[PDB]
Amino acid sequence: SRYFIEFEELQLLGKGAFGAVIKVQNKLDGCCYAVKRIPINPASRQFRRIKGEVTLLSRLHHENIVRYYNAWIERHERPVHYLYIQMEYCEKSTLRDTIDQGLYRDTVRLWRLFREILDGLAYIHEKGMIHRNLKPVNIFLDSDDHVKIGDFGLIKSDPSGHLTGMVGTALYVSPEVQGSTKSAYNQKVDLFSLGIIFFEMSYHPMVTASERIFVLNQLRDPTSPKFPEDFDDGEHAKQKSVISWLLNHDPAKRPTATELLKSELLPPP
Amino acid sequence: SRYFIEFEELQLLGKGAFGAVIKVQNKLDGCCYAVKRIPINPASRQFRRIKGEVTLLSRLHHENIVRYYNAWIERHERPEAVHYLYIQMEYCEKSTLRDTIDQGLYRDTVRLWRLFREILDGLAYIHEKGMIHRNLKPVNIFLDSDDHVKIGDFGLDLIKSDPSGHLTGMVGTALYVSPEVQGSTKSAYNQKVDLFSLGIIFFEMSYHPMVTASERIFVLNQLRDPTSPKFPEDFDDGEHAKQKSVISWLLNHDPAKRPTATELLKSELLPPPQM
Ligand SMILES: CN1CCN(c2ccc3[nH]c(-c4c(N)c5c(F)cccc5[nH]c4=O)nc3c2)CC1
Ligand SMILES: CN1CCN(c2ccc3[nH]c(-c4c(N)c5c(F)cccc5[nH]c4=O)nc3c2)CC1
C-alpha cells in the first residue's frame, strides 16, 4: 500500500460521509499534503462521479485553486477499495478560521482575499464548471496569505431552543437547487455561496450558534433580505451592494464572476 | 410488406426520434444492407423534406459516400394506419469512425491523415454538387472491409449527462454544429457548417480516446470556446503541429475564415498521399 509506505500521517484535517482528509508528509520530498481518502465501489455510479471529478480537477490550473498532486486507487484486505487524492496543504489555516479571528477589521485584506476567490471562481467558470462546494471550510490560505479554493465533494444545534431555519452547509446552498422546486444547478449557484461567504468575511465573528442561525437565515430571506443593525449602509455600503447582488433570489439577476471583477463596486488591485 | 418478405433483420445499428437503422440481408442476392426505417405521414411538409433528401441522396456517386440501393414507402398495421419510408443503403463491414477514434486512431499518423483526406474527397463532391451535409459526425461516417471512409446519409446550465455533476455546456450532437447555426441564425446554412464539424471530427481523430463522459464533455467544449479555442495540453507539436494548424483553420468562429473542402486538399498543411 503506497499510502502507508510513502506517506507519514500527521493530523486529521476533516471527516464525514465522503470519508476523510489527512495532513500527511511524503517520506521522500518531505512536504506536507492534504490526501483525501474516499472508500469506493469501483462498479458503482459513485465511482463514475469521483473518477469524473479527478479528471476535471487534474485539468484545473490556477493560482487561486488548491493544487492537485496525484490520485490513485488502493484495494484493502477482508474487513474493499479506497481512492486517494493528494492535494496541496495550505499552511495558513482555512477561510473559516480567518473569519473567526477578525478578518472584518482589515478592509484592505478583506477585499483582496474576496477578489482572489473571484479570480479562481472565474477560472473554474470559464472552463465551464460548477463547484457546488464553495463554503469557508473548503477555501484556504497559504504561507503568503493567498486564497486557495478547495476541491469539490427545529434546530438541535441552537442552545436557546427557539430557532428554526437551515443550518450548516445548507445555508450556502442556493434556493433554486432546494425543496420540491428544484430549478436546475447553474454557475449562478456558486455566486450565491460567495455572497454568504463575503458577508461573513465583512462581518464580526458570530460567537453564539443562536446569533449565527438568526443572522444568516435572515440574510437568506426572499421576503426580507436582512443585514444586521451593526452592518450599516454607511461604513460598508459597497460591501452591502456586492452581497445583495450575489444573494438576489433570481438566479438570473446575479452577476457572473467576470461581471463582478469588471464592476466599479470592487476596489482596484 | 416488401421489407418483411424480401429482407431478413440481423441487427439494429442505431435508433432515435427520426426512426432507426437496421442491418438487413436480402434473401435474393445474399447481401447485407443498412435499411433506415422512418415513420412518416405523406400529407405533412416533413415528408416533402424527406422525399427531397431521397431525391438528392440518389444523385450522389463517390467511393467515399455510403452507396444508395433503393427507397420505398410501406403502409403497415391497422388501428389510424401507420406509414413508413425505407431507404436501403450500403453496409460497411469494419466499423464506424467513432469506434476507430475510441480504439486509438491518434497513434497511426499514416491512417489518420489518409482517412481524413478520404472524408475531404467525399465532402468536396457533396459540395461540388451544390449540397450541404448537416450530419457530419463520427457515428455517421463508417469504414468498410477495405478500411475506407464512407460518409453516411443526411437524416434531418448543468448537463445531466455528466457523471461528476459539475460540467456546463454542449453535449452530444450540438458539439459538431457550427456556432452560426445555434443562437443567432442569419446564414445558418452554408457549406462551411460541414467544414466546422470536420474540425471537431479531425480533433478527436488526432487526440487520444476520451472514454470518460466528463473528459469528452470538457475537452470538446474547451475547443468550441468562441472567446478562446482551448486545445488540450496533452496534444504535442513534435508528433503533430500541422494537425493543430488544420483543426484551427476549420474551427474559425467566423465561417468566412474556414477553408472550402477543395481549398484544404490544395493546402500544404495536408501531407500528400503515397498509396
Ligand atoms: C481550529 N482550526 C481547525 C482547522 N485548521 C486547519 C489548519 C490547516 C488546514 N489545511 C487544510 C486543508 C484542507 N482541509 C484541504 C482539503 F480539505 C482539500 C484539499 C486541500 C486541502 N488543503 C489544506 O491545507 N485544512 C486545515 C484546517 C486550523 C485550526
Ligand atoms: C465497432 N462497432 C461495431 C458494431 N457497430 C456498427 C458496425 C458497423 C456499422 N455499419 C453501420 C452503418 C450505418 N449506421 C449506416 C447508416 F446509419 C446510414 C446509412 C448507411 C449505413 N451503413 C452502415 O454500414 N453502422 C454500424 C455499427 C458499432 C461499431
Coordinates of C-alpha atoms and ligand atoms in Angstrom, one line a residue:
Chain A
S1 CA 0.0 0.0 0.0
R2 CA 1.5 3.3 -1.4
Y3 CA -0.3 5.4 1.2
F4 CA 1.2 3.8 4.3
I5 CA 4.6 3.1 2.8
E6 CA 5.3 6.5 1.1
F7 CA 3.3 8.9 3.4
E8 CA 3.6 9.8 7.1
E9 CA 0.1 10.6 8.6
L10 CA 0.4 13.8 10.8
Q11 CA -3.1 15.1 11.7
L12 CA -6.7 14.6 10.7
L13 CA -8.0 17.7 8.7
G14 CA -11.6 16.7 8.1
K15 CA -14.1 13.7 8.3
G16 CA -17.6 12.8 7.1
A17 CA -19.9 10.8 4.8
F18 CA -17.3 11.2 1.9
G19 CA -14.5 9.8 4.1
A20 CA -11.7 11.9 5.4
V21 CA -8.9 14.5 4.6
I22 CA -5.5 13.8 6.3
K23 CA -2.4 16.1 6.8
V24 CA 0.4 13.8 5.6
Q25 CA 4.1 14.1 4.9
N26 CA 5.7 12.4 1.9
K27 CA 8.7 10.4 3.2
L28 CA 10.8 11.2 0.1
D29 CA 10.3 15.0 -0.7
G30 CA 9.4 16.0 2.9
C31 CA 6.4 18.2 2.1
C32 CA 3.0 18.2 3.7
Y33 CA -0.1 17.3 1.7
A34 CA -3.9 17.0 2.2
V35 CA -4.7 13.5 1.0
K36 CA -8.5 12.9 0.6
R37 CA -9.3 9.1 1.1
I38 CA -12.7 8.1 -0.2
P39 CA -14.0 4.5 0.2
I40 CA -15.3 3.5 -3.3
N41 CA -17.1 0.6 -5.0
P42 CA -15.3 0.5 -8.5
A43 CA -18.5 -0.8 -10.1
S44 CA -21.0 1.9 -8.7
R45 CA -22.2 5.1 -10.3
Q46 CA -20.4 6.8 -7.3
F47 CA -17.1 5.7 -8.9
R48 CA -18.2 7.3 -12.2
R49 CA -18.8 10.6 -10.3
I50 CA -15.4 10.6 -8.4
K51 CA -13.3 9.5 -11.4
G52 CA -15.1 12.2 -13.3
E53 CA -14.1 14.8 -10.6
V54 CA -10.5 13.5 -10.6
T55 CA -10.4 14.1 -14.4
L56 CA -11.7 17.7 -14.1
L57 CA -9.5 18.7 -11.1
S58 CA -6.3 17.3 -12.8
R59 CA -7.0 19.8 -15.6
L60 CA -7.6 22.9 -13.3
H61 CA -4.5 25.2 -13.1
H62 CA -5.0 28.4 -11.2
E63 CA -3.1 30.4 -8.6
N64 CA -6.3 30.6 -6.5
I65 CA -7.3 26.8 -6.8
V66 CA -5.9 24.2 -4.5
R67 CA -3.1 22.3 -6.4
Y68 CA -3.6 18.6 -7.5
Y69 CA -0.5 16.3 -6.9
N70 CA -1.8 12.7 -7.6
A71 CA -4.8 10.3 -7.4
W72 CA -4.7 6.5 -7.0
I73 CA -7.0 3.6 -6.0
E74 CA -5.9 1.0 -3.4
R75 CA -7.5 -2.4 -2.6
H76 CA -7.6 -3.3 1.2
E77 CA -7.8 -6.8 2.8
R78 CA -11.1 -8.6 4.1
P79 CA -12.6 -6.2 6.8
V80 CA -12.7 -3.2 0.0
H81 CA -11.5 -0.1 -2.2
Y82 CA -10.1 3.3 -1.3
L83 CA -9.4 6.3 -3.7
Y84 CA -6.7 8.7 -2.6
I85 CA -6.4 12.3 -3.9
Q86 CA -3.2 14.1 -2.9
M87 CA -3.6 17.9 -2.9
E88 CA -1.7 20.9 -1.5
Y89 CA -1.5 21.6 2.2
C90 CA -2.3 25.3 2.7
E91 CA -0.3 26.0 5.9
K92 CA -2.0 29.3 7.0
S93 CA -5.5 27.9 8.0
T94 CA -9.0 27.8 6.3
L95 CA -11.1 30.9 5.5
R96 CA -13.4 29.7 8.3
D97 CA -10.7 30.2 11.0
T98 CA -9.6 33.5 9.2
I99 CA -13.2 34.9 9.7
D100 CA -13.4 33.7 13.3
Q101 CA -10.1 35.6 14.0
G102 CA -11.3 39.1 13.0
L103 CA -10.9 39.4 9.1
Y104 CA -13.6 42.0 9.1
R105 CA -11.3 44.6 10.9
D106 CA -8.8 44.6 7.9
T107 CA -10.9 46.0 4.9
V108 CA -7.7 46.1 2.7
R109 CA -7.2 42.3 3.3
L110 CA -10.9 41.5 3.3
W111 CA -11.3 42.9 -0.3
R112 CA -8.1 41.3 -1.5
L113 CA -9.0 37.7 -0.5
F114 CA -12.5 38.3 -1.9
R115 CA -11.0 39.3 -5.3
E116 CA -8.8 36.2 -5.2
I117 CA -11.9 33.9 -4.5
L118 CA -13.4 35.6 -7.7
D119 CA -10.3 35.1 -9.8
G120 CA -10.3 31.3 -9.0
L121 CA -14.1 31.1 -9.4
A122 CA -13.8 32.9 -12.8
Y123 CA -11.2 30.4 -13.9
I124 CA -13.4 27.4 -12.8
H125 CA -16.4 29.0 -14.5
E126 CA -14.6 29.9 -17.8
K127 CA -13.6 26.2 -18.1
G128 CA -17.4 25.6 -17.9
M129 CA -17.8 24.0 -14.5
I130 CA -19.9 24.5 -11.3
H131 CA -18.1 23.9 -7.9
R132 CA -21.3 23.1 -5.9
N133 CA -19.0 23.1 -2.7
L134 CA -17.8 26.8 -2.0
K135 CA -18.0 27.1 1.8
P136 CA -15.4 28.7 4.3
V137 CA -14.2 25.3 5.4
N138 CA -13.3 24.5 1.7
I139 CA -11.3 27.8 0.9
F140 CA -7.8 28.1 2.5
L141 CA -4.8 30.3 2.8
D142 CA -1.2 29.5 2.1
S143 CA 2.1 30.8 3.7
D144 CA 1.7 34.0 1.5
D145 CA -1.9 34.7 2.8
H146 CA -3.4 33.8 -0.7
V147 CA -6.8 32.2 -1.3
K148 CA -6.8 28.6 -2.5
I149 CA -10.3 27.3 -3.4
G150 CA -10.6 23.7 -2.3
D151 CA -11.7 20.7 -4.4
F152 CA -15.3 19.5 -5.0
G153 CA -17.1 16.9 -2.8
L154 CA -36.4 22.7 14.5
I155 CA -32.6 23.1 15.0
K156 CA -31.0 20.9 17.8
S157 CA -27.6 22.9 17.3
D158 CA -29.4 26.0 18.8
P159 CA -28.8 26.4 22.5
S160 CA -31.8 28.8 23.0
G161 CA -34.2 26.1 21.6
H162 CA -36.4 28.6 19.6
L163 CA -34.5 28.8 16.3
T164 CA -35.9 27.5 13.0
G165 CA -34.3 27.5 9.5
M166 CA -31.5 25.8 7.7
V167 CA -28.2 25.1 9.4
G168 CA -24.6 24.3 8.3
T169 CA -23.6 23.7 4.7
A170 CA -27.3 24.2 3.7
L171 CA -27.0 28.0 4.5
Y172 CA -24.6 28.3 1.5
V173 CA -26.7 26.1 -0.9
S174 CA -28.7 28.3 -3.5
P175 CA -32.5 28.5 -3.0
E176 CA -33.2 27.4 -6.6
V177 CA -31.4 24.0 -6.0
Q178 CA -33.6 23.3 -2.9
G179 CA -37.0 21.9 -1.9
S180 CA -39.6 20.5 -4.4
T181 CA -39.0 23.5 -6.8
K182 CA -35.5 22.1 -7.9
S183 CA -34.8 24.8 -10.6
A184 CA -31.6 23.2 -12.2
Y185 CA -28.0 23.7 -10.9
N186 CA -26.3 26.6 -12.6
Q187 CA -22.9 28.5 -12.3
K188 CA -25.1 31.3 -10.6
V189 CA -25.3 28.9 -7.6
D190 CA -21.5 29.3 -6.9
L191 CA -22.1 33.1 -6.7
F192 CA -24.9 32.7 -4.1
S193 CA -22.4 30.7 -1.9
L194 CA -19.9 33.6 -2.4
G195 CA -22.4 36.3 -1.2
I196 CA -22.9 34.4 2.1
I197 CA -19.1 33.8 2.4
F198 CA -18.4 37.6 1.7
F199 CA -21.0 38.7 4.3
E200 CA -19.2 36.6 6.9
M201 CA -15.9 37.9 5.6
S202 CA -17.1 41.6 6.0
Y203 CA -18.9 40.9 9.5
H204 CA -17.6 40.3 13.0
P205 CA -17.4 36.6 14.2
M206 CA -20.9 35.4 15.4
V207 CA -19.7 33.9 18.8
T208 CA -23.0 32.0 19.6
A209 CA -24.9 29.5 17.5
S210 CA -28.2 31.4 18.2
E211 CA -26.6 34.5 16.7
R212 CA -25.2 32.7 13.6
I213 CA -28.5 30.9 12.8
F214 CA -30.6 34.0 13.2
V215 CA -28.3 36.3 11.2
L216 CA -27.5 34.0 8.2
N217 CA -31.2 32.9 7.9
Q218 CA -32.5 36.5 8.0
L219 CA -29.9 37.3 5.2
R220 CA -31.3 34.3 3.2
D221 CA -34.9 35.5 3.4
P222 CA -36.6 36.1 0.0
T223 CA -39.4 38.2 1.7
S224 CA -36.8 40.0 4.0
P225 CA -33.1 40.1 2.8
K226 CA -31.8 41.4 6.2
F227 CA -28.2 42.7 7.2
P228 CA -27.8 43.2 10.9
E229 CA -28.1 46.7 12.6
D230 CA -24.2 46.7 13.1
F231 CA -23.7 46.1 9.3
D232 CA -24.7 49.8 8.4
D233 CA -25.2 51.2 4.9
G234 CA -22.7 53.9 6.0
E235 CA -19.3 52.3 6.6
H236 CA -19.9 49.2 4.4
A237 CA -22.3 50.4 1.5
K238 CA -20.3 48.8 -1.4
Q239 CA -19.9 45.5 0.6
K240 CA -23.7 45.6 1.2
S241 CA -24.2 46.1 -2.6
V242 CA -21.9 43.2 -3.7
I243 CA -23.6 40.8 -1.1
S244 CA -27.1 41.9 -2.2
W245 CA -26.3 41.5 -5.9
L246 CA -24.9 37.9 -5.3
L247 CA -27.7 36.9 -3.0
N248 CA -30.5 38.0 -5.4
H249 CA -33.2 35.3 -5.2
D250 CA -33.5 35.4 -9.0
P251 CA -30.6 33.2 -10.3
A252 CA -30.7 35.4 -13.4
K253 CA -30.3 38.8 -11.6
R254 CA -26.9 37.6 -10.0
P255 CA -23.6 38.7 -11.8
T256 CA -21.1 36.5 -13.5
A257 CA -17.7 36.1 -11.8
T258 CA -16.1 38.3 -14.6
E259 CA -19.0 40.9 -14.3
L260 CA -18.3 41.4 -10.5
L261 CA -14.5 41.7 -11.3
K262 CA -15.2 44.3 -14.0
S263 CA -17.5 46.1 -11.6
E264 CA -17.0 49.6 -10.0
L265 CA -18.1 48.2 -6.6
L266 CA -14.9 46.3 -6.1
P267 CA -11.7 48.4 -5.2
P268 CA -8.6 48.2 -7.6
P269 CA -5.9 45.6 -7.1
Chain B
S1 CA -44.9 -5.9 -46.7
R2 CA -41.8 -5.8 -49.0
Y3 CA -39.4 -5.2 -46.1
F4 CA -40.5 -8.4 -44.3
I5 CA -40.9 -10.6 -47.4
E6 CA -37.6 -9.6 -49.3
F7 CA -35.3 -9.0 -46.3
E8 CA -34.1 -10.6 -43.0
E9 CA -33.2 -8.4 -40.0
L10 CA -29.8 -9.2 -38.5
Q11 CA -29.0 -6.3 -36.1
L12 CA -30.2 -2.9 -35.0
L13 CA -27.4 -0.3 -36.0
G14 CA -29.0 2.8 -34.4
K15 CA -32.2 4.5 -33.2
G16 CA -33.8 7.9 -32.3
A17 CA -36.9 10.1 -32.8
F18 CA -36.1 10.2 -36.6
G19 CA -36.6 6.4 -36.8
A20 CA -34.0 3.6 -36.9
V21 CA -31.2 2.0 -38.9
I22 CA -31.3 -1.8 -39.1
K23 CA -28.8 -4.2 -40.7
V24 CA -30.7 -6.4 -43.1
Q25 CA -29.9 -9.3 -45.5
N26 CA -31.6 -9.5 -48.9
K27 CA -33.0 -13.1 -49.4
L28 CA -32.4 -13.0 -53.2
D29 CA -28.8 -11.7 -53.5
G30 CA -27.4 -12.6 -50.0
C31 CA -26.0 -9.1 -49.3
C32 CA -26.3 -7.1 -46.1
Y33 CA -27.6 -3.6 -46.1
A34 CA -28.4 -0.7 -43.7
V35 CA -32.2 0.0 -44.1
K36 CA -33.1 3.3 -42.5
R37 CA -36.9 3.0 -41.5
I38 CA -38.6 6.4 -41.0
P39 CA -42.2 6.7 -39.7
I40 CA -43.9 9.3 -42.0
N41 CA -47.2 11.0 -43.0
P42 CA -47.5 11.8 -46.7
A43 CA -49.6 14.9 -46.3
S44 CA -47.0 16.6 -43.9
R45 CA -44.3 19.2 -45.0
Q46 CA -41.8 17.0 -43.1
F47 CA -42.3 14.1 -45.6
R48 CA -41.7 16.6 -48.5
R49 CA -38.3 17.4 -46.8
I50 CA -37.5 13.7 -46.6
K51 CA -38.6 13.0 -50.2
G52 CA -36.3 15.8 -51.3
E53 CA -33.4 14.2 -49.4
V54 CA -34.0 10.8 -51.0
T55 CA -34.0 12.7 -54.4
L56 CA -30.6 14.3 -53.6
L57 CA -29.1 11.2 -51.9
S58 CA -29.9 9.1 -55.0
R59 CA -27.9 11.6 -57.2
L60 CA -24.6 11.2 -55.3
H61 CA -21.9 8.8 -56.6
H62 CA -18.5 8.8 -54.9
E63 CA -16.4 6.0 -53.3
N64 CA -16.3 7.9 -50.0
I65 CA -20.1 8.3 -49.8
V66 CA -22.3 5.4 -48.4
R67 CA -23.8 3.8 -51.6
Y68 CA -27.7 4.1 -52.0
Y69 CA -29.5 1.0 -53.3
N70 CA -33.4 1.6 -53.2
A71 CA -36.2 3.7 -51.5
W72 CA -39.9 2.9 -50.9
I73 CA -43.0 3.6 -48.7
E74 CA -45.0 0.9 -46.8
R75 CA -48.5 1.3 -45.4
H76 CA -48.3 -1.2 -42.5
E77 CA -50.5 -2.1 -39.4
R78 CA -54.3 -1.2 -38.6
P79 CA -55.8 0.9 -35.7
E80 CA -55.3 5.2 -37.9
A81 CA -52.9 3.1 -40.2
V82 CA -49.1 4.0 -39.9
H83 CA -46.8 5.0 -42.9
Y84 CA -43.1 4.1 -43.1
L85 CA -40.3 5.1 -45.5
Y86 CA -37.4 2.8 -46.0
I87 CA -34.0 3.7 -47.5
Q88 CA -31.7 0.8 -48.4
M89 CA -28.1 1.8 -48.3
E90 CA -24.6 0.0 -48.3
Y91 CA -23.4 -1.9 -45.2
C92 CA -19.9 -1.1 -44.1
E93 CA -18.3 -4.1 -42.5
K94 CA -15.4 -2.7 -40.4
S95 CA -16.8 -0.1 -38.0
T96 CA -18.0 3.4 -37.5
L97 CA -15.3 6.2 -37.4
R98 CA -16.4 6.7 -33.7
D99 CA -15.2 3.1 -32.9
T100 CA -11.9 3.8 -34.7
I101 CA -11.2 7.0 -32.7
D102 CA -12.3 5.1 -29.5
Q103 CA -10.0 2.2 -30.3
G104 CA -7.0 4.6 -30.7
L105 CA -6.6 6.2 -34.1
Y106 CA -4.5 9.1 -32.9
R107 CA -1.4 6.8 -32.8
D108 CA -1.4 5.7 -36.5
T109 CA -0.4 9.0 -38.2
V110 CA -0.4 7.4 -41.7
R111 CA -4.0 6.0 -41.3
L112 CA -5.4 9.2 -39.5
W113 CA -4.3 11.5 -42.4
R114 CA -5.5 9.1 -45.1
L115 CA -8.9 8.6 -43.5
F116 CA -9.2 12.4 -43.2
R117 CA -8.3 13.0 -46.9
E118 CA -11.0 10.4 -47.9
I119 CA -13.6 12.4 -45.8
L120 CA -12.5 15.6 -47.6
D121 CA -12.8 13.8 -51.0
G122 CA -16.4 12.8 -50.2
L123 CA -17.2 16.3 -48.7
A124 CA -15.6 18.1 -51.8
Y125 CA -18.0 16.1 -54.0
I126 CA -21.3 16.8 -52.0
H127 CA -20.2 20.5 -52.0
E128 CA -19.4 20.5 -55.9
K129 CA -23.0 19.1 -56.5
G130 CA -24.3 22.2 -54.6
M131 CA -25.2 20.4 -51.3
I132 CA -24.6 20.8 -47.5
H133 CA -24.5 17.6 -45.4
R134 CA -25.5 18.9 -41.9
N135 CA -24.9 15.3 -40.4
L136 CA -21.1 15.0 -40.4
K137 CA -20.5 13.2 -37.1
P138 CA -18.1 10.2 -36.2
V139 CA -21.2 7.9 -35.7
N140 CA -22.4 8.8 -39.3
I141 CA -19.0 8.0 -41.0
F142 CA -18.2 4.4 -41.5
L143 CA -15.4 2.1 -42.6
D144 CA -15.9 -0.9 -44.9
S145 CA -13.8 -4.1 -45.1
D146 CA -11.1 -2.4 -47.2
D147 CA -10.6 0.3 -44.4
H148 CA -12.1 3.2 -46.5
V149 CA -14.2 6.2 -45.5
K150 CA -17.9 6.1 -46.2
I151 CA -19.9 9.2 -45.2
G152 CA -23.4 8.3 -44.2
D153 CA -26.7 9.8 -45.5
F154 CA -28.4 13.0 -44.2
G155 CA -31.3 12.3 -41.8
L156 CA -32.7 15.6 -40.7
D157 CA -26.7 25.1 -17.2
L158 CA -25.5 21.8 -15.6
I159 CA -25.5 19.0 -18.2
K160 CA -27.4 16.0 -16.6
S161 CA -25.5 13.5 -18.9
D162 CA -22.2 14.2 -16.9
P163 CA -21.4 11.7 -14.1
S164 CA -19.3 14.2 -12.0
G165 CA -22.1 16.7 -11.8
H166 CA -20.0 19.9 -12.4
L167 CA -19.8 20.3 -16.3
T168 CA -21.7 23.0 -18.2
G169 CA -22.2 23.5 -22.0
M170 CA -22.7 21.4 -25.1
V171 CA -23.5 17.7 -25.1
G172 CA -23.6 15.1 -27.9
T173 CA -24.8 16.3 -31.3
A174 CA -24.6 20.0 -30.5
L175 CA -20.8 19.7 -30.2
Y176 CA -20.5 19.4 -34.0
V177 CA -23.0 22.0 -35.1
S178 CA -21.4 25.4 -36.2
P179 CA -21.9 28.4 -33.8
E180 CA -23.6 30.5 -36.6
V181 CA -26.4 27.8 -36.6
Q182 CA -27.1 28.0 -32.9
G183 CA -28.5 31.1 -31.1
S184 CA -28.1 33.7 -34.0
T185 CA -29.4 32.1 -37.3
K186 CA -28.9 34.7 -40.1
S187 CA -26.8 32.5 -42.6
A188 CA -27.0 29.1 -40.6
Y189 CA -26.9 27.3 -43.9
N190 CA -23.5 27.4 -45.6
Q191 CA -21.2 24.6 -46.8
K192 CA -18.8 26.0 -44.1
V193 CA -21.1 24.4 -41.5
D194 CA -19.9 21.0 -42.7
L195 CA -16.3 22.0 -42.5
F196 CA -16.7 23.1 -38.8
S197 CA -17.9 19.6 -37.9
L198 CA -14.9 18.2 -39.8
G199 CA -12.6 20.2 -37.4
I200 CA -14.2 18.6 -34.3
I201 CA -14.0 15.2 -36.0
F202 CA -10.3 15.7 -37.0
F203 CA -9.5 16.9 -33.5
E204 CA -11.0 13.7 -32.0
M205 CA -9.2 11.6 -34.7
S206 CA -5.8 13.3 -33.8
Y207 CA -6.4 13.2 -30.0
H208 CA -6.5 10.1 -27.6
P209 CA -9.7 8.2 -26.7
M210 CA -11.8 10.2 -24.2
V211 CA -13.5 7.1 -22.7
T212 CA -14.9 9.2 -19.8
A213 CA -18.1 11.3 -20.4
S214 CA -16.6 14.0 -18.1
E215 CA -13.4 14.1 -20.3
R216 CA -15.2 14.2 -23.7
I217 CA -17.7 17.0 -22.5
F218 CA -14.8 19.1 -21.0
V219 CA -12.2 18.6 -23.8
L220 CA -14.7 19.2 -26.7
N221 CA -16.4 22.3 -25.1
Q222 CA -12.9 23.9 -24.5
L223 CA -12.2 23.6 -28.2
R224 CA -15.6 25.1 -29.1
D225 CA -14.9 28.1 -26.8
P226 CA -15.8 31.2 -29.0
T227 CA -13.7 33.7 -27.0
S228 CA -10.6 31.4 -27.0
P229 CA -10.5 27.8 -28.7
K230 CA -8.5 26.0 -25.9
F231 CA -7.0 22.6 -27.1
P232 CA -5.6 20.1 -24.5
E233 CA -2.0 20.3 -23.1
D234 CA -1.5 16.5 -24.0
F235 CA -1.8 17.4 -27.7
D236 CA 2.0 17.6 -28.7
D237 CA 3.7 19.5 -31.7
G238 CA 6.7 17.3 -32.1
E239 CA 4.4 14.4 -33.3
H240 CA 1.6 16.8 -34.6
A241 CA 1.7 20.7 -35.3
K242 CA 0.3 20.5 -38.9
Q243 CA -2.7 18.6 -37.4
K244 CA -3.3 21.5 -35.0
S245 CA -3.0 24.1 -37.8
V246 CA -5.8 22.3 -39.8
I247 CA -8.1 22.0 -36.7
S248 CA -7.7 25.8 -36.1
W249 CA -8.3 26.5 -39.9
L250 CA -11.6 24.6 -39.8
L251 CA -12.9 25.7 -36.4
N252 CA -12.6 29.5 -37.1
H253 CA -15.7 31.1 -35.3
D254 CA -16.1 33.2 -38.5
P255 CA -17.3 30.9 -41.3
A256 CA -15.6 33.1 -43.9
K257 CA -12.2 32.3 -42.4
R258 CA -12.6 28.5 -42.7
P259 CA -11.3 26.7 -45.9
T260 CA -13.5 25.1 -48.6
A261 CA -13.1 21.3 -49.0
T262 CA -11.0 21.8 -52.2
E263 CA -9.0 24.7 -50.6
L264 CA -7.9 22.4 -47.7
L265 CA -7.0 19.5 -50.1
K266 CA -4.8 22.1 -52.1
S267 CA -3.3 23.3 -48.7
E268 CA 0.4 22.3 -47.9
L269 CA -0.7 21.6 -44.3
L270 CA -2.1 18.3 -45.7
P271 CA 0.7 15.7 -46.2
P272 CA 0.3 14.3 -49.7
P273 CA -0.9 10.7 -50.4
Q274 CA 1.6 7.8 -51.0
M275 CA -0.7 4.7 -51.5
Ligands
LIG1 C1 -9.3 25.1 14.6 N1 -8.9 25.1 13.2 C2 -9.3 23.8 12.5 C3 -8.9 23.8 11.1 N2 -7.4 24.0 11.0 C4 -6.8 23.8 9.8 C5 -5.5 24.1 9.5 C6 -4.9 23.9 8.3 C7 -5.6 23.3 7.3 N3 -5.3 22.9 6.0 C8 -6.4 22.4 5.5 C9 -6.5 21.9 4.1 C10 -7.6 21.2 3.7 N4 -8.7 20.9 4.5 C11 -7.7 20.7 2.3 C12 -8.8 20.0 1.8 F1 -9.8 19.7 2.6 C13 -8.8 19.5 0.5 C14 -7.7 19.8 -0.3 C15 -6.6 20.6 0.1 C16 -6.6 21.0 1.5 N5 -5.5 21.7 1.9 C17 -5.4 22.2 3.2 O1 -4.4 22.8 3.5 N6 -7.4 22.4 6.3 C18 -7.0 22.9 7.5 C19 -7.6 23.2 8.7 C20 -7.0 25.3 11.7 C21 -7.4 25.2 13.1
LIG2 C1 -17.2 -1.4 -33.7 N1 -18.7 -1.4 -33.6 C2 -19.3 -2.5 -34.5 C3 -20.8 -2.5 -34.4 N2 -21.3 -1.2 -34.7 C4 -21.5 -1.0 -36.1 C5 -20.8 -1.7 -37.0 C6 -21.0 -1.5 -38.4 C7 -21.9 -0.5 -38.8 N3 -22.3 -0.1 -40.1 C8 -23.2 0.8 -39.9 C9 -23.9 1.6 -40.9 C10 -24.8 2.7 -40.6 N4 -25.0 3.1 -39.4 C11 -25.4 3.4 -41.7 C12 -26.3 4.4 -41.6 F1 -26.6 4.9 -40.3 C13 -26.9 5.1 -42.6 C14 -26.7 4.6 -43.9 C15 -25.8 3.6 -44.1 C16 -25.2 2.9 -43.0 N5 -24.3 1.9 -43.3 C17 -23.7 1.2 -42.3 O1 -22.9 0.2 -42.6 N6 -23.5 1.1 -38.6 C18 -22.7 0.2 -37.9 C19 -22.5 0.0 -36.5 C20 -20.8 -0.1 -33.9 C21 -19.3 -0.1 -34.0

